[model samples]
Target chain A: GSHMAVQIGFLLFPEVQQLNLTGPHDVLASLPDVQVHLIWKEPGPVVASSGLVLQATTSFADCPPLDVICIPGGTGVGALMEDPQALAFIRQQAARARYVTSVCTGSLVLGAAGLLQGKRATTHWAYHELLAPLGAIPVHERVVRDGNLLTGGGITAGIDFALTLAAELFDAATAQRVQLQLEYAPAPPFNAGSPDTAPASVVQQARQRAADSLHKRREITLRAAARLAA
Target chain B: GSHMAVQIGFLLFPEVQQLNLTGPHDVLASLPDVQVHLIWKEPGPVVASSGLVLQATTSFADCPPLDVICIPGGTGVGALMEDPQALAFIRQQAARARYVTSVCTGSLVLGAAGLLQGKRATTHWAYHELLAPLGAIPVHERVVRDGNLLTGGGITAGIDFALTLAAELFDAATAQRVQLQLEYAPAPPFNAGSPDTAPASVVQQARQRAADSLHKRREITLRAAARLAA
Candidate 1:
């Protein structure tokens, strides 16, 4: 019960997307006096979706009780959706954590943990519909917060999500300080972040490229949802 | 030279500002058929300034020739500015890299390597003026390009720099696709990323807080400039 440090942990896993974790991790860690942990089932190197390797700082069994626990999505989330061990770890952490959150497809894994039931959440645009089977209300926004559950849409949304969460945990001034430190004034060369704003052709190409992955994600989500229900 | 794959590498070191590396890294790696490397002097984990740990994928001696070489900046950069090994490696890479690039204070290291001599470049706003001693024409912008050298203003500017580089490497459509994939549409909750946009009080506060580190950086940069001259 001692409020010594505000501890935050991000789940690290093989084939996980780096940005989903790194974007929020960078934003949150820059806050003064906050502790951040990169945790996994075991200790050692974990490869991200883009071949970047990150080291796991703590094992699940040894991890301190965190104020916040975050899960990031990538090609690996599909596997974790059906993974009882990972789901169980998330469930346990969410039970005790003040905030349970996700970025990109990570929300789907939270759904697999049965935490999104009746909760409004968001995920990567390509996998938004998959949340329906898991009992989540998929909101098409950069970030959506429902009670203690917060979810970010897609990879880059993590920056906004982290900043919002910073305000909740600390104060607006503190979050603003962190934002300034990060130089968060983004200037995208193109205006194609979302389906509505992006050119139809570009959006269509993206959708087409992700079609296979989306199909696989849907099939796994159904299986995971049934398992959670049982 | 066979155009089989686009090879890109980001420098990893102790006390690195994680966002400087992760922001652009996430964007660049999203491109198709691209190989991304986290290169360092030795293999193992490198801690960032915020205490986050990242694993390096390749050692300098073992790294292949890269198409693009990126250096990220943080408190650790001051040390690299005077490091013979680091400067030599950068100089060697810049000799052949199609695009020599940096984000934040990384350009300072590039200057220390004598690569920025007579080149127009940019760095973190607070350190922008320091580039003059390295013979760099300090251009105040989010991203600057002169010849094959590309430089970004600060931490978040890496996203903009990376997307811009992506466009150059491929085409506007390819860059747009990568931006769309990462959901590059950023919505910052604050307008304090740069001195020009930030409130006077916030800018003052940031400058005051960074004073000590900036002082040390200036001293080291001066020494490195002397070394480069010698």
Candidate 2:
């Protein structure tokens, strides 16, 4: 009746990509024996990428030693990368973690923590170049597993990364069961997600729109990278 | 320069798939010009589809009247349908809502409120027939829109439904912009979500796995329906 299993810790930050956290939540919630905790910097509510608010049960100090540590991405990562406190927390916790993972731009945070330096990783397509500054070999793939660090591309890529995570920790059969339980079989009506798969015209159009936001985001992160190097 | 716009309300219930709520959260969060609120039956922390705990910004009695109300389904629907107080609250709020939408079995909760009586609706595949008892005409489709009321199929359908909802409420340009922002295009490694697309053996397996849950849900809702009618 009781099974002792692996524990996974998901870091919660303000404005974090809601899906990056939720997609994996869908898969892992179905695991019968796994212990999952959402660890946050402070208590109360943390607003996500889409304004959906999540409450944290455990603060950073209260979290149990994790077998896996997962950090999800959003605009918040830009700020998180510059915070020595946050980065130190990640580095310290990840030292004991068997596997450290990230989704979308979350890899950039891991890279800042020096977890991905000299290692291959993936992140949201928009920030692939940012990974290099952190000494990470950025892979333009959905999910890339290099040693103990696993990363995924973009917002939606979390689903793929999670399935692979499940496969990595548990047997394939258990992973498949979680997939089926969450009904992970996806069917999108549109054919535009990443730069490689979307049409040239559509991709360009998106880039044009994101030009301003990306420009500002890039500037902030670049400055943070400089500060960290100093 | 902040432009005043409408507020969007997303209801979060305990045991509901956080992805269904969060997927849309990512898309709508990009609308920096609009306000999005996370609502629940009470003003406190609520656990999600599994172990993820999130906080609610507003309770049912306190949240502002919204431009739209997006409800998502999970294991919670069966229990929620039986709460007459919650059912009444949904009906009261929906009467004046610009758009009322649900993902997966969330439509069944709407049906319990008498909002779906004589309305065409859809839900997660396995629960299709159960809709009829609530006086709803259950249509087997991924997305069903009847005027301002919308119902989407199973877990992941929330992504498509939210994308389409954005197009309808905002502009095609805005919806497409958010779509690209969140990278809405999805790809599944397996085709086992619905009965039509799934392999015969897998579909059978799904049915068998869900049989007990389905039966208990039926009994619970049937009891609620009788009480609502009385």
Candidate 3:
């Protein structure tokens, strides 16, 4: 099993939070002898939430069965909650992959797909309640694993999620080796990413900004969800 | 002018070193308010030397003027010596860009572009002499900023190059903000990246694997240089 070249299928969509995708991307790409294919609904570029556009290698129709199908959290997931094609694709892939993972609010999309109905999951704290509506048990943990499903909290937690998954894939020593190669010594210059440790005022400011993004995401999600139901 | 959005461009090419492109990519993408774009000859997914692929945003044909053009180092630069079109593009961009920077052997390609002609540039220690072939002065610094031209040693130096560049672009406070956001702490498990610091055996092992890659690059550069002359 360790000898197999782990095929990682990373879902890329419009308005994804870039860090949620790239933070794990760097770590997974660093894993010696692993294959990571960036997947998008189409064959061109996918714009991140911040307007940064990234290229994806595989399209949903052409993508092969993956060892791991990772959904990166962003406001885009909310939009995908309604895209019949995108939700169908994630559900299809999740059915075959050995492990299915999501980062940030990406979990919410998985819940919308009905994959998290009975699963314990976690998402970006800002959208923890959204998971509840989809029938998932939302935990506040930074990284949560229930069976083959993995999810990480907001932003930089993608790295920790990848690390935790790496450990499971190749043992702590192998994961540690990859971690060492990445110089995974995180030193956040600001303490405003998560509410637990961030200052109250900063958290409020960040939450406000996040809430605005969330509101927009909700509008987008409703459309997609309605389409899926239709 | 200080209130303007920071334009960060990442150069992409065939066979570009994965680590050279990714290490700093992970860090710079975390910068607040900075606009990041991946530039390449073709405007789509560009495959790295490691088999990992990335989506590139801007093509040489349609890119806007960049504030910071990051030239990632790689063994592939050996072929770039004769890519007149690429050289012309780089020369055009580098001539007017606010900053002209390189990572690892990126100086080799930069030197070939004639931007580094007679300018003291640092590169991977082992290839410092190669700069002389391209008419550039060589230095031993890990991260060297001479006027608008910045260069660094191989692979991991990308982080330092970016950190230093960020400091220059946004003041120490904003740079530190990004640095803190990226968790700018470094703790590499193995110190075998450089010839000077790596153990002799480790260096030997790497050199053996690098032999073919370097040779291919050298051949390509010779052809590219001839094309430049034509």
Candidate 4:
């Protein structure tokens, strides 16, 4: 069935892990008759964790209601978890969005908004343990769906998450077409994508590098969970 | 032994396939002490083929010599192929770069700059045949390396290309560490990433959809090749 023009918005913030958002943005925005927006506190230049800069097309104050709303996670998500306006924007969009979604630690933001209470979700494997603190039923998988809330794990999984959304919004056939356009076949040089698949030593090394960031995220997630409980 | 801080630049232009750049940017920028610059004719917002906006961090006039330089392709490459300043910048950077690389149709730009003369390379499957006109020896591999020229096939291959670069510049362990952090394990919901693997009907549909774009790229590539000969 041909659908009308659909709006999809991904929240933009400084220090975003670009792939967590760009991976999906590149896929979803190309849909026929779709308008993809990068919404932020304001529409302007936003630097990502990678130091590459992105421009937000719309601000929270001016964004139209979105059919699909996504939050992409990074170290920057730390501040967003504490920003009420961002949380409110998320809640506002989620109230009417056909799907509320996130990639990587973005599920942390969804949980912070009080949207993931008992909802089965997935996030970056490093932060999966933190999800429970934010009232989410953490799942260990590439992509997880519980009702209208869909979450993908880690940065690269955003591709899988968006393609899944494409299937749900239209049809699997349409989603596959988008996949074909992007040449979505992935071949990593190393088998270190997951802690389970990666060498235990590499996993330990990754965890060590993320230790500080993970600590901060956990603390913030707990506080957000407390607020949601209240 | 550890190396000094490396400088990498990616050419950003209007109508870029954002993933072609962002996939690699997100990966390359996170390297320890590495500086990844998004270089273009000027520094500003550049709307991508998918309508997402990216910010070019530096202008060709101000771009410093880079250790590695990459071109990311999309419909935008058609205009770039005809732009003298852009081609000059590619040549300027390539002269001293330890590695010259491209993702997707970006290889066409390298060819346009005369940097790929008889160099083995790869590009998006849909436009792989166009490489020859630009004087490249086209290879079908996802990530092809001939001498210091490395090219990745299509959008998603940028991730692999960057990881490979990481290994080349530093070591396998460092690259694998980055891969683990990004959780690069990919699980596509469908097997339609390439014309070879996609359902014949889907491949036909994709080729039809891209027919106009392919035609334009070919015309521009032929012109660029002719210019190089002269």
| Candidate 4 local Cα displacement, residue B219, angstroms | 1.8
Query: Each prediction's TM-score against the native?
Result: 0.96, 0.89, 0.70, 0.96
**Candidate 4 chain B lDDT trough over 10 residues, lowest sum:** B1-10
What's the lDDT for all of these models?
Answer: 0.89, 0.77, 0.71, 0.89
* Model 1 alpha-carbon miss at residue A206, Å: 1.0
For B53-119, candidate 4 gives per-residue lDDT tens digits of: 8888889999888999999989899999999999889988899899999999999888888988888
Interface RMSD, per-candidate values to 1 decimal: 1.1, 2.5, 6.0, 0.9
The better candidate by lDDT, 2 or 3, is 2
The per-model DockQ list reads 0.76, 0.44, 0.12, 0.82
Which stretches of model 4 miss by more than 4 angstroms?
Answer: A1-3, B1-3
Superposing all C-alpha atoms, what RMSD in Å does each candidate have to the true structure?
1.8, 3.0, 5.9, 2.1
Given candidate 2, what's the lDDT at residue A52?
Answer: 68
Per-residue lDDT over B134-164 for candidate 3, one digit per residue giving the tens place of the 0 to 100 score: 6677787777878899887766566677767
Number of the predicted model whose DockQ against the real structure is largest = 4
**Models sorted by DockQ, best on top:** 4, 1, 2, 3
Candidate 1: lDDT of B107?
96
- For residues A61-171, write the lDDT of model 2, one tens digit per residue: 777788889999987887888777778778888998999999888888887777776899988766677887777887767788898888878888887788788877875
DockQ of 3: 0.12
Candidate 2: lDDT of B92?
78
Clash count in backbone of candidate 3: 12
